[PDB]
Design an enzyme around this catalytic site. Structure first.
Site, short mmCIF file in Angstrom:
data_model
loop_
_atom_site.label_atom_id
_atom_site.label_comp_id
_atom_site.label_asym_id
_atom_site.label_seq_id
_atom_site.Cartn_x
_atom_site.Cartn_y
_atom_site.Cartn_z
N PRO A 13 -15.19 -2.76 6.77
CA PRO A 13 -13.86 -2.25 7.14
C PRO A 13 -13.95 -1.31 8.32
CG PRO A 13 -14.09 -2.20 4.76
CD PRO A 13 -15.46 -2.53 5.33
N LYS A 59 -16.24 -1.26 -0.82
CA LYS A 59 -17.23 -1.83 0.09
C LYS A 59 -18.34 -0.82 0.33
CE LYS A 59 -14.42 -5.30 1.95
NZ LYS A 59 -14.70 -6.54 2.73
N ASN A 100 -1.25 1.22 9.85
CA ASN A 100 -1.08 -0.23 9.80
C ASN A 100 -2.30 -0.82 9.09
OD1 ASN A 100 1.38 -0.48 11.12
ND2 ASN A 100 0.50 -0.42 13.14
N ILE A 132 -11.75 -7.19 5.49
CA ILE A 132 -11.75 -8.56 4.96
C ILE A 132 -11.45 -8.44 3.47
CG2 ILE A 132 -12.98 -10.68 4.65
CD1 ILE A 132 -14.82 -9.77 7.08
CL LIG Z 1 -14.54 -5.62 6.00
#
Ligand SMILES: [Cl-]
Ligand SMILES: CC1(C)C=Cc2c(ccc3c2OC[C@@H](c2ccc(O)cc2O)C3)O1
Ligand SMILES: [Cl-]
Ligand SMILES: [Cl-]
Ligand SMILES: [Cl-]
Ligand SMILES: [Cl-]
Ligand SMILES: [Cl-]
Ligand SMILES: [Cl-]
Ligand SMILES: [Cl-]
Ligand SMILES: [Cl-]
Ligand SMILES: [Cl-]
Ligand SMILES: [Cl-]
Ligand SMILES: [Cl-]
Ligand code: NA
Lengths: 114, 114, 114
Positions: free
Chosen positions: A1, A32, A97, A64
């Site tokens: 991220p 993550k 966002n 993701i």
């Molecule tokens: Cl990611």
């Protein structure tokens, strides 16, 4: 991220340890590994929010997966809380966002994650 | 909505009131109240357009709704006109990317708009 | 297309020819004429990648078409190669987000490409 914060607050107001705190809190929040988390803080920007140049921030979180209705509400509480506590920015002068990236559209180390 | 302009024009060439003008004109163009409009202007950037380092700008407009074929043409005429008249940037050296955000993916005030 | 790189490498370490090298290499890779390639390099950023502040880069490539699984894998090799050789950034400290833009959502020269 990847988490990016753009703000008009001065660099000297960004506490030492802020990037690590963002890294660790986002690792906990997204689930993550911190090794996959990138953070980017951009102070001293020429910005306005609602026509006023009081402290504000424009941010983005790309991941993701781990993006969605309830999760984003949770991220917004976490991230507005950090920006309020550490940068003294009112939460109603923060936009974040959120971007759920397809693995095929995220490059890293000579390939993508697909 | 959020409007960002990155440009290689120097900060001293950005006229006083530019962030206020962008706020007011984007409120009019999008139909959203100016309280909801955030603007971010980033001068003095290391940029090229077509391999030339003459004045240029790379911009984005994000909005929950109010994005579409005809609207974006209208935004582009407005924004290129402002960059030309205020920052002396040729309209053929401007890109503006438009993003229609889902409310669930926009954080604000410890929550999201979903 | 538009290519953006944000990095913590200092400005003096960014070669004067880097934007032109990116422009030419991206024109070949995307198959688009160089006149439509824009490049933006942002050095001296406050960033961390995996919790450490060694050189890193967060990048994005936007294009109307020429984006996809196989193409993006190839772009990542080109862009990691350039960032490694010219900015001395390890390729496992590079993220590149890829965006396939609709022509209606890209403004230029007072209009959009739709
Ligand atoms: Cl990611
Ligand atoms: C800092 C960074 C960039 C975070 C990504 C990363 C890494 C080292 C090793 C791996 C990384 O992310 C991908 C992970 C992986 C790769 C492909 C895949 O399909 C799934 C994965 O979980 C392996 O260092
Ligand atoms: Cl880790
Ligand atoms: Cl969710
Ligand atoms: Cl995507
Ligand atoms: Cl909005
Ligand atoms: Cl429309
Ligand atoms: Cl969205
Ligand atoms: Cl393009
Ligand atoms: Cl583009
Ligand atoms: Cl160059
Ligand atoms: Cl492809
Ligand atoms: Cl699009
Ligand atoms: Na984006």
């Amino acid at each position: 991220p990847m988490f990016i914060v753009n703000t008009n607050v001065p660099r000297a107001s960004v506490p030492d340890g802020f990037l690590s705190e963002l890294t660790q809190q986002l690792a906990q929040a997204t689930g993550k590994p911190p090794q996959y988390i990138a953070v980017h803080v951009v102070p001293d920007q020429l910005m306005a929010f609602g026509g006023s140049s009081e402290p504000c921030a424009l941010c983005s979180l790309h991941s993701i997966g781990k993006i969605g209705g309830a999760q984003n509400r949770s991220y917004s509480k976490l991230l507005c809380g950090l920006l309020a506590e550490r940068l003294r920015i009112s939460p109603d002068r923060v936009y974040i966002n959120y971007y759920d990236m397809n693995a095929a559209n995220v490059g890293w180390n000579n390939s993508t994650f697909a």
